[PDB]
């Protein structure tokens, strides 16, 4: 299973006219292209080593797309500021994301796409990709002006056709990295809080993809509790890190175990200290 | 006549339009339209590019700010209807305008590269 | 309000041939008849450049190309064999953003007419 996700953000700026518009493209959990109409290069650039072999033909077309999307948004922001009867003084945020998921079989599994205005769900593309559904009792306007216009189509077509075919085009281009599974370098540490309690912090380092699990159990078996779990953070080298700790009455440390579930693992590991 | 319209040019309401895909600046497009012996698009009503209303691109039109009359003016000297683009108020007078068959206008830098539309009258 | 003499009133002319930008959504069959009611044929795709034009005017549209069973040859309106490429129970051809695709003959889509 793989995915081609794109994330588009347009923030408006009352002062300096043109709203800022940023696009990032992720294959799986690897970013490869970005566009930033506020940088040294107002065009689409590569963010992955395996894209620096593409030609003008591609970098141009994609800039055509990015720049054109950004104008549509400059409008939209206005268009919306209208609907929501908003202060022309304030600054607001329009977000758009879409992506295609391939089944294990390598072929299209499902597609998604939706808009958001000011951190709130605005418009969503129906599962069946055949129509748009408003969310705010004010996106109803954009609904029937997209169902009518029947944009549902060219969109349903992107996800199933272009997006899928391209995802494959990318997975091939970046074969060596995108596809290689990198299991976590697990290991437990001890951290006394007082004479009575100690923290057992189970680590998971340098892994990819970013989905994982980390679970504590002990003597007895499943669960325990009095646990802390942190958001899976990026290392920066493309891999990730997560840790799960638990507090333990001293001496009992060896009752507890940590169960790491990852896709890079033959089967779940277990740690002790 | 009324059925000339070069080739790769499209005729409508007895006028000869030319939606480009090529992208150039304003002063550039202005001159290109001149060579082809036509004008940078000048809108009557938003129903002029009706046949293209499904478009999402933005094309340079022939609007600019007149230092002289302290007003936005078409290239032909005539003034801009208060209606066409309702926000003309907030266009920066240092920018040129780019239009979209829907009815939407954007004021961008006279330098920025954009698509253009040429028009030939026939009356 | 003067308009061209060779082509119908609100129609547009591009390359020796006249066009009618639909804006109404109809099924392949409905479109077929409509275009005929308007004394013309359904939209045919002459050149791969007439297609870069068409893709600037309207995003998607039915075209005069279909299949009988989910497998016989793709056929133009002239009973002839189609000489371009095109993407289940789909049997009518559409034009979608400068590409030719297979769609559901029962789907409602935009249609354009075209003359010689």
């Amino acid at each position: 299973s793989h995915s081609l996700k794109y994330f588009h953000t347009s923030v408006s700026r009352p002062g300096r006219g043109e709203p800022r518009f940023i696009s990032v493209g992720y294959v799986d959990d690897t970013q490869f292209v970005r566009f930033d109409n506020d940088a040294a290069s107002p065009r689409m650039v590569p963010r992955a080593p395996w894209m620096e072999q593409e030609g003008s033909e591609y970098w141009d077309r994609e800039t055509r797309s990015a720049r054109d999307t950004a104008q549509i948004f400059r409008v939209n922001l206005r268009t919306l500021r209208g609907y929501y009867n908003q202060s022309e003084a304030g600054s607001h945020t329009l977000q758009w994301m879409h992506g295609c998921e391939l089944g294990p079989d390598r072929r299209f599994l499902r597609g998604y796409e939706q808009f958001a205005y000011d951190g709130k769900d605005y418009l969503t593309l129906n599962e069946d990709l055949r129509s748009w559904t408003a969310v705010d009792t004010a996106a109803q306007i954009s609904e029937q002006k997209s169902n009518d216009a029947s944009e549902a189509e060219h969109q349903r077509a992107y996800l199933e056709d272009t997006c899928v075919e391209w995802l494959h085009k990318y997975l091939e281009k970046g074969k060596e990295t995108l596809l290689h599974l990198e299991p976590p370098k697990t290991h437990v540490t001890h951290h006394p809080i007082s004479d009575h309690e100690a923290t057992l912090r189970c680590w998971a380092l340098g892994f990819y993809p970013a989905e994982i699990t980390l679970t504590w159990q002990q003597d007895g078996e499943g669960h325990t509790q009095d646990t802390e779990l942190v958001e899976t953070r990026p290392a920066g080298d493309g891999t990730f890190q997560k840790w799960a700790a638990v507090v333990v009455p001293s001496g009992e440390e060896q009752r507890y175990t940590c169960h790491v579930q990852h896709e890079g693992l033959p089967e779940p590991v277990t740690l002790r200290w | 006549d009324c059925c000339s319209c070069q080739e790769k040019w499209v005729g409508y309401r007895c006028n000869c339009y030319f939606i480009s895909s090529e992208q150039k600046t304003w002063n550039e497009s202005r001159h290109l339209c001149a060579s082809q012996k036509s004008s940078l698009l000048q809108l009557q009503n938003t129903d002029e590019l009706d046949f293209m209303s499904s478009s999402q691109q933005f094309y340079w039109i022939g609007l600019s700010y007149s230092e002289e009359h302290t007003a936005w003016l078409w290239e032909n000297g005539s003034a801009l209807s208060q209606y066409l683009f309702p926000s003309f108020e907030t266009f920066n007078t240092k920018n040129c305008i780019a239009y979209n068959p829907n009815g939407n206008a954007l004021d961008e830098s006279c330098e920025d590269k954009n698509r253009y539309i040429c028009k030939q009258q026939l009356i | 309000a003067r308009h061209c003499g060779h082509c119908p009133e609100e129609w547009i002319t591009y390359s020796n041939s006249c066009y009618y930008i639909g804006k109404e959504r109809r099924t392949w069959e409905e479109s077929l008849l409509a275009c005929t009611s308007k004394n013309s044929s359904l939209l045919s795709i002459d050149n791969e450049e007439e297609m870069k034009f068409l893709s600037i005017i309207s995003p998607s549209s039915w075209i005069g190309v279909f299949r009988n069973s989910s497998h016989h040859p793709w056929v133009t309106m002239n009973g002839l064999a189609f000489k371009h490429e095109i993407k289940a129970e789909l049997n009518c051809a559409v034009l979608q953003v400068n590409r030719l695709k297979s769609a559901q003959c029962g789907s409602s889509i935009i249609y354009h007419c075209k003359h010689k």
């Binding site: 588009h8 591609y58 990015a66 948004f73 939209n76 954009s142 060219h154 969109q155 391209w166 | - | -």
Partner: peptide
């Protein structure tokens, strides 16, 4: 490659 066309809300 990002969706060709977006949406005019």
């Amino acid at each position: 490659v990002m969706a060709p066309r977006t949406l005019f809300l």
